[PDB]
Amino acid sequence: TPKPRILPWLVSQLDLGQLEGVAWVNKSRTRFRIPWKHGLRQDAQQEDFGIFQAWAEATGAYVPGRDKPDLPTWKRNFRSALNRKEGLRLAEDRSKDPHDPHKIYEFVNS
Amino acid sequence: PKPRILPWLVSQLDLGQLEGVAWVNKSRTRFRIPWKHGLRQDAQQEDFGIFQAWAEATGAYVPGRDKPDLPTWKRNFRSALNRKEGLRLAEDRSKDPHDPHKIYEFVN
Amino acid sequence: MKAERKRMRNRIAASKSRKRKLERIARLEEKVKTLKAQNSELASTANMLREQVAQLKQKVMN
Amino acid sequence: KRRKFLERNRAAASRSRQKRKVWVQSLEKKAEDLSSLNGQLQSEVTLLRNEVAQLKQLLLA
DNA sequence: ACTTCTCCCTTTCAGTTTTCCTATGTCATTT
DNA sequence: TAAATGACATAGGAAAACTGAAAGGGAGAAG
């Protein structure tokens, strides 16, 4: 059980495309999109934190049963990891958009 | 010359010539180190003295144009201690408002 | 016993922040009031000295 | 109808906050300019005060 | 005197986690 | 009744420290 590096892991989640709202938006796999609803809307289901949560359980930070959910932290760490990943970058911040908030990241190299 | 870390750290402790750095246990078995986070504006090298001492001691931080490097002095000190099997943390008060510190204990 | 106290640290700080932000505005409102008032007084003095430049020129030229 | 009432209040709080912010920015810009305008007058008074004394002491009296 | 280990701490890998701040969602009140 | 807004408590962020685990020095020790 080696620790998954975040970019490859994030990429496979994309390809398998099982988690909703998480998927390429450019069929040429170069730009993808992550649900990013604010953790204060009462109408919030994990669906809005599936990636933040999955990566958390994936590294062993969140072991269901032992731990207490923590949506803000799961989201904070996920965003921070991607942030210093030079080779990836935001490209759009639809984060506060009323009907389907999200951020769209994009790959690069130079 | 060229010091070894455990004996040197111990002498700093006996002499107790650096605040916050001393034994916390009669039988000199558990000692404590100031560990304030280097981002509180209320932090300038006094809460980073031992990390600083070790840097000069190994001849790393030569006060002369060796532009200070709080982060590094702290990182190297923690790392050296970390792989010193026979010593271990026992408490991480690091983020404690009023006395940031970590307490290390010798595995008697 | 760790997280519950920590939220408190956050709200107190938040309260300090919301309150502090208002005070900066009050300090700010007072300044615009002092500036318009000080400034008008100066424009008149600028004119009073200015009236003289026309006045001295007639007196000096002679 | 619980969800729409919440969605509506929230859009409004945003509509309100954006308005409060523009006024604050509007207040500060006004603030920079008065201090800046205040600045010209202190100097102009100085050029004039010397202009009146230099023109008056040397040329007439 | 010349090469290979080693012993012992330094670096860096690849993400986390703090600090200090700001921005929102949700009430409770106004308007 | 429906927008605005004042108050709160939480959530979200940019920068830069901080970290355990894991590969790097380097100056003596061995051969």
Which domains are assigned to chain C?
1-62 (1.20.5.170)
- Pairwise CA distance, residues A26 & A23, whole Å: 9
Q: Which fold has domain A5-108?
A: Arc Repressor Mutant, subunit A (1.10.10)
Coil, strand, or helix at residue A88?
strand
User: In Å, how far is D25's CA from the nearest CA of chain A?
Assistant: 22
Q: What are phi and psi of D31, to 5 degrees?
A: -65, -40
CATH for the D1-61 domain, from 3.30.565.10, 3.40.50.10860, 1.20.5.170, 3.40.50.720: 1.20.5.170
3-state SS string for chain B: CCCCHHHHHHHHHHHCCCCCCEECCCCCCEEEEECCCCCCCCCCCCCCHHHHHHHHHCCCCCCCCCCCCHHHHHHHHHHHHHCCCCEEEEEECCCCCCCCEEEEEECC
- Residues near B14 by beta carbon (within 8 Å), at least 6 away in sequence: B28
Domain boundaries, chain D: 1-61
CATH number of B4-107: 1.10.10.10
Residue type, D34: L
Q: Could you say which residues 43-102 of protein chain B have a Cβ atom less than 7 A away from any atom in strand E?
A: 54, 58, 60, 72, 75-76, 79-80, 83-84, 95, 100
D8 CB less than 7 Å from any atom of strand E: no
∠ Cα A32 A82 B74 (to 5°): 175
**Distance, CA of A76 to CA of A83 (rounded, Å):** 10
**What's this structure's resolution in Å?**
3.0
Method of elucidation: X-ray
- Check: CB of residue A20 under 8 Å from CB of residue A26: no
User: What is the chain A residue with the closest CA to D4?
Assistant: A43
User: Is A56:A50 a contact under the CB 8 Å cutoff?
Assistant: no
Distance between start and end Cα atoms, chain A: 33
Q: How would you classify the pairing of strands A88-94 and B22-23?
A: unpaired
In chain B, what are the domain boundaries? 4-107
H/E run at residue C24: helix C3-61
Burial class for C16, CB neighbours closer than 10 Å (0-12, 13-18, 19+): exposed
Residue in D27, D41, D48 closest to C32 by CB:
D27
Task: Yes or no: say if A104 and A89 are a contact pair by the CB < 8 Å rule.
Answer: no
Residue A49 DSSP symbol: G
Helix (H) or strand (E) holding A6: helix A6-16
Tell if B88 CB is < 7 Å from nucleic strand F: no
